[PDB]
Each structure stands twice: as C-alpha cells, then as structure tokens.
C-alpha cells in the first residue's frame with residue numbers, strides 16, 4: 308500500500324503569538340553547534356515510495372554524517388556512518404563529511420535547505436522548503452535533557468524536491484506526494500541521557516504533529532515521558548505519556564551490544580493511545596561506538612485520538628549514548 312505523504316503550505320512560525328525562546332534562522336548556522344537532521348517521506352514520479360534519512364552531528368570528540376534509504380515496497384535498506392574531524396565556525400548552515408551533508412540555500416539559513424549524500428550505496432540530493440508550522444518542543448522550544456538544557460524545533464511537513472539514485476537510476480521526487488521532517492537540536496551539556504526513544508508521528512486525518520521523548524533523568528531521579536504536539540493555528544500541547552516497549556519482536560544490533568524492540572504502546576494523557584510497529588527489522592545506522600549508532604526506523608501505527616480511531620506513520624529513534632551499566 309501507499310502512504311498519503313504530502314506537504315503543508317503555511318508559515319514557519321505562524322502568528323508568532325507564542326513567545327518561543329529563540330529565532331529559528333539565528334539557530335541554524337554551524338557556529339551554534341549540535342545536530343541537524345532530516346527524514347524525507349518520498350513518492351517518486353513512478354509511484355515508488357521511500358524513506359530517506361540524513362544526519363550531521365558536531366561533537367567535541369568528532370563529527371559524523373550518517374544516512375539511510377528504505378524502499379517501502381521491498382524493504383531494501385542501506386545505511387552508512389562516516390566520521391569527520393571538525394565543523395567550521397561559519398555564520399551559515401553548511402555541514403559535511405566528504406561530499407555528504409546538510410546546507411541552507413537561502414539567506415535566512417532556513418527557508419530552503421538541502422540534504423545530500425554521494426555514497427556508493429546511499430546517493431541522494433533532496434531540497435525542502437520551510438512551508439510547515441514549527442514544532443517547538445516543550446512549548447517554547449527548550450526542555451531538560453540530561454544534566455542540562457536542550458533546544459529543539461521540528462519542521463514537520465516541508466515541501467520536498469530533488470532525487471534519489473537507486474541502482475544507477477536517478478529517481479525524481481514528486482513534491483505533491485512527499486514531505487520532509489527537519490529537526491534541529493543543540494545542547495547545553497555533554498551529560499545527556501544514557502539512552503532514549505524518540506517518536507516522530509504523523510496522523511493524516513488531522514493537523515497534529517507529534518514529537519515525543521522518553522528517557523530517565525538520573526540527576527533529578529525522575530522519568531521523562533512526554534509529547535509536544537503541534538496542532539492547527541500554532542496551538543501546542545505539552546502532555547505526559549506512558550511508554551511500553553514490547554520485545555515480542557526484536558532486532559539485535561550489528562555491534563552485539565544492544566537489543567531493540569520493534570513494537571510499542573503509547574498512551575498520551577488526554578489525547579489518545581497508539582500501537583506502533585517497526586516497518587521492517589533492520590533499520591540500524593551502524594557506527595564505531597554508541598553515540599554513532601542508532602535505530603532510525605520507519606513505523607506505522609493505529610490508535611484512537613479523542614475517541615476516534617486513527618492510523619498513521621512516522622519514525623522511531625532509539626539511541627544509547629553509552630553501552631555501559
């Protein structure tokens with residue numbers, strides 16, 4: 308079956324009625340540091356569907372770019388991680404390891420963006436425009452993440468163009484039936500949680516876009532488990548949830564260090580309940596250490612929102628910042 312991927316056509320910060328704690332443009336450039344990330348839900352001109360990931364991380368120990376493609380008809384999956392050394396402190400967005408990276412193509416560092424990769428098994432060149440109301444995590448764009456603060460916003464349904472090269476054939480992206488979620492996150496500390504799960508959810512019968520985080524805070528000795536939900540008209544919901552990982556189906560990491568569940572239940576307080584399933588077993592970006600490794604998998608789900616049955620899709624991220632303990 309085909310999914311109803313499609314873009315939004317709205318303003319990035321809506322009315323600006325909600326006083327978020329940064330400007331999006333000013334937060335984009337290399338000099339700010341942190342993480343730049345995109346997941347594109349693509350229909351090509353020949354009606355094939357793919358999910359393509361791109362991710363650049365700056366860290367004081369190293370940098371890396373990592374990327375994957377997933378064919379939704381056949382489950383054919385390809386990934387790589389390539390390690391770099393440093394990030395230039397420039398006042399625009401242009402991060403790369405080799406001939407792969409993420410950059411802005413507009414003066415405001417935000418309105419037109421590009422994720423590109425030229426690996427032999429992972430080759431694409433994807434542009435996307437900020438035509439989608441932002442998700443300001445936590446309500447105003449910041450929340451407690453490990454020992455200190457994190458700052459995060461998502462652009463959930465960006466109009467998307469370009470191409471993906473599959474077995475020597477360059478496939479063109481259909482912008483009427485595609486969209487990209489771009490996520491920008493930068494940080495306060497090196498003491499981030501030991502591991503987490505992050506959900507990025509789309510419910511096509513609604514205007515809700517969900518960015519949900521679950522992890523332990525050993526510094527306050529509490530459990531973080533919440534969703535930031537952007538609705539229509541800039542409305543934002545910050546809601547507790549209950550998280551249940553289900554290990555009936557698992558995928559064993561290629562590093563031998565962890566086992567990933569492949570199904571979950573979420574109960575988001577006052578909003579709805581969901582049953583989520585990884586689309587195929589192997590969706591792991593395999594790096595040399597823990598922070599370079601992640602499960603980044605396309606998922607589908609069913610559930611109920613405000614007593615109405617719903618179906619949807621999105622991505623689950625599973626990260627261990629350390630394999631110790």
Ligand SMILES: *[C@@H]1O[C@H](CO)[C@@H](O[C@@H]2O[C@H](CO)[C@@H](O[C@@H]3O[C@H](CO[C@H]4O[C@H](CO[C@H]5O[C@H](CO)[C@@H](O)[C@H](O)[C@@H]5O[C@H]5O[C@H](CO)[C@@H](O)[C@H](O)[C@@H]5O)[C@@H](O)[C@H](O[C@H]5O[C@H](CO)[C@@H](O)[C@H](O)[C@@H]5O)[C@@H]4O)[C@@H](O)[C@H](O[C@H]4O[C@H](CO)[C@@H](O)[C@H](O)[C@@H]4O[C@H]4O[C@H](CO)[C@@H](O)[C@H](O)[C@@H]4O[C@H]4O[C@H](CO)[C@@H](O)[C@H](O)[C@@H]4O)[C@@H]3O)[C@H](O)[C@H]2NC(C)=O)[C@H](O)[C@H]1NC(C)=O
Nearest residue numbers: 501502503504520521522523550551552553554555625632
């Ligand atoms: C971030 O990463 C985290 C780590 O990967 C991850 O957390 C993990 O999540 C999973 C999924 O929820 C948890 O798995 C459950 O675990 C339950 C047991 O949990 C207890 O034990 C573990 C292990 O403790 C050992 O190991 C740790 C380190 O690994 C040590 O720190 C401990 O000291 C201890 O060490 C000893 O043992 C080791 C051997 O294992 C030795 O190596 C060692 O030397 C020592 O000898 C603890 O970590 C747990 O503590 C943590 O969690 C609790 C909350 O649960 C907190 O209170 C605590 O503070 C910690 O945070 C805890 O102590 C399993 O019981 C459970 O499986 C049952 O439930 C599922 C689902 O319902 C069933 O499918 C399953 O079949 C089991 O059901 C049976 O059993 C129950 C209970 O009796 C019955 O009610 C049920 O009906 C059924 O019984 C029937 O079937 C049985 C089986 O056939 C049968 O025997 C019966 O007779 C009956 O017929 C599930 O597997 C896992 O614990 C988490 N781990 C941690 C560390 O938290 C986290 O999700 C990630 N975060 C995110 C956001 O992604």
